[PDB]
Design a protein around this ligand. Structure first.
Ligand SMILES: Nc1n[nH]c(N)c1/N=N/c1ccc(O)cc1
Lengths: 252, 305
């Protein structure tokens, strides 16, 4: 429905994973870890960030229903990406995804003979898992991403290519590092992204002639008290993430 | 393993195949608790070696988007392992009706049918979807007399380095000239061609251009709509398959004449002629056809009984 995949804070704390004794902080790592695995595979498999993001969202929702203690991120992530790639028009072959997921989780090991049975199984497992992801998501595989609205947000502030790129950066990273995709609609997340991208670049946008703030043309429900509340949380976890801010840090 | 958003299809009591002959494996079924009638399409997994079929993902994507009085309605998706698409049930298919001899259509009812059909097409096109499988058999009608377009199996989104859409689409009999001349940059106008054939079928009770091969199809189309001259269809040259294979040369348009006997109504014939136009860029669109004097003269479009 319209609110089936959006949760409260009280709901995120009482996650399926919490119910099996996984601390609140570990669940978050577990998520981030899956995100990273998706990104690493996604780049080797030569698919788009759009696909990777769709996969990351599948993974997020999936773990609002299933628990990490029954489905390990390193199993779900590849199946999730296998699915996203089909959905977003960039299908990758089942054997191709297994191949890549392997060298990602086992940089050292060598790929079993694609004739063995221990391989024929890990192929059946992926397929099985993709089925479980579909059923879990109830076949809602059409995902809206904050990125879509970033153009529309940054078009307003007439920001440089630079503030734009940075805003997308914030977008993608919010998917990796936070559970925003589970709490706030894309257009709101998009605002949070631009807002923080501005703070970071020191960019300041003047109030318009109407007297309205830049973000009211984006979502009726967005308020400065929220943007500051969110961009703080987002910035915090970005500071905890090694080498991440460096990518948008002005070194001049 | 938990599953709050995908019910076991066992909640539906199967009844009868309706049917495999329509290109899909479809059952009628009854909600064990409410009696609600539904159609279950199984997702066929024979010869599928790449997980859940990308084909079925398209269809489900499209149906979840297409919500409209004249488009079949996906209610939910069910499991059991196997996966089922579940629709609101449609008692009739326009082909079963047209072949049944005890069934009889008044001009006003036919108006209504075409209206719904064309209105349904307007919606999907507006939503950037091509049906690509127009045929009487794919036009359903509910017991309360509402028409629904169905079977979005070969369906596909379209948009605007020309396009490279699949060319092997549309049943041969309802396939337009563009696709027989090997076109790969098409759009809405193809579905409307089918709308044409279907409309004609409404008086002739039988598909009007039943070819054996693609060259035989283009053959029949010319004997009815005229030859494929750049006089009629500007730039029909650039198509390699143009001269490469047959075609005629002396054919003059016999659409109105050949159908005259069956159709009768002048406005009816007039609309059929603008639907069965050779050049897609000149073939009437769904908006203008809904506005054609056919639907705004007597008798007026009436409900179905
Ligand atoms: N709803 C229905 N009632 N009776 C049918 N044959 C019927 N078919 N529905 C379909 C069939 C195929 C499809 O891709 C989508 C809907």
């Amino acid at each position: 429905n319209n609110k089936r995949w959006y949760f409260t804070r009280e709901q995120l704390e009482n996650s399926p994973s919490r119910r099996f004794g996984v601390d609140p902080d570990k669940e978050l790592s577990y998520r981030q870890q899956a995100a990273n695995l998706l990104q690493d595979m996604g780049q080797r498999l030569n698919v788009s960030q759009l696909t990777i993001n769709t996969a990351i969202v599948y993974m997020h929702r999936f773990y609002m229903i299933q628990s990490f203690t029954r489905f390990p991120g390193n199993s779900v992530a590849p199946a999730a990406l296998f699915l996203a790639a089909k959905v977003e028009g960039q299908p990758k072959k089942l054997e191709h995804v297994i191949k890549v997921a392997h060298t990602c989780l086992h940089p050292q090991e060598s790929l079993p003979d694609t004739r063995s049975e221990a391989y024929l199984q890990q192929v059946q497992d992926l397929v099985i898992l993709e089925s479980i992801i579909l059923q879990t998501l109830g076949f809602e595989l059409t995902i809206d991403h904050p990125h879509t609205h970033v153009v529309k947000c940054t078009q307003l502030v007439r920001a440089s290519k630079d503030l734009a790129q940075t805003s997308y950066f914030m977008a993608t990273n919010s998917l990796h590092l936070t559970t925003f995709s589970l709490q706030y609609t894309p257009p709101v997340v998009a605002c949070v992204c631009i807002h923080l991208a501005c703070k970071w670049s020191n960019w300041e946008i003047p109030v318009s002639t109407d007297g309205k703030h830049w973000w009211e043309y984006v979502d009726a429900t967005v308020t400065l008290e929220l943007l500051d509340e969110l961009t703080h949380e987002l910035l915090q976890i970005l500071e905890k993430t090694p080498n991440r801010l460096k990518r948008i840090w002005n070194w001049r | 393993v938990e599953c709050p958003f995908c019910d076991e299809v066992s909640k539906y009591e199967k009844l009868a195949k309706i049917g495999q002959g329509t290109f899909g494996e479809v059952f009628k079924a009854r909600h064990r608790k409410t009696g609600q009638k539904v159609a279950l399409k199984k997702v066929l997994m024979e010869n599928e070696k790449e997980g859940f079929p990308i084909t079925a993902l398209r269809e489900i994507k499209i149906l979840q988007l297409l919500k409209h009085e004249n488009v079949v309605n996906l209610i939910e998706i069910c499991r059991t392992g196997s996966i089922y698409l579940v629709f609101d049930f449609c008692e009739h298919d326009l082909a079963g009706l047209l072949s049944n001899v005890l069934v009889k259509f008044t001009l006003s009812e036919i108006k209504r049918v075409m209206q719904m059909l064309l209105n349904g097409l307007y919606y999907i096109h507006r939503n950037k979807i091509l049906h690509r499988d127009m045929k009487a058999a794919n036009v359903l009608i509910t017991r309360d007399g509402v028409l629904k377009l169905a079977d979005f199996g070969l369906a596909r989104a379209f948009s605007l380095q020309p396009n490279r859409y699949t060319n092997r689409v549309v049943t041969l009999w309802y396939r337009p000239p563009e696709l027989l001349l090997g076109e790969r940059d098409y759009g809405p106008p193809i579905d409307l061609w089918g709308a044409g054939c279907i409309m004609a079928e409404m008086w002739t009770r039988s598909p009007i251009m039943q070819g054996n091969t693609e060259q035989h199809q283009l053959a029949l189309i010319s004997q009815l709509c005229g030859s494929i001259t750049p006089e009629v269809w500007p730039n029909v040259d650039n198509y390699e398959l143009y001269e490469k294979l047959e075609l005629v040369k002396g054919q003059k348009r016999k659409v109105k004449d050949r159908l005259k006997a069956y159709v009768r109504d002048p406005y009816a014939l007039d609309l059929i002629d603008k639907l069965l136009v050779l050049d897609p860029a000149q073939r009437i669109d769904s908006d203008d056809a809904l506005n054609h004097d056919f639907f705004w003269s007597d008798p007026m479009p009436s409900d179905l009984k």
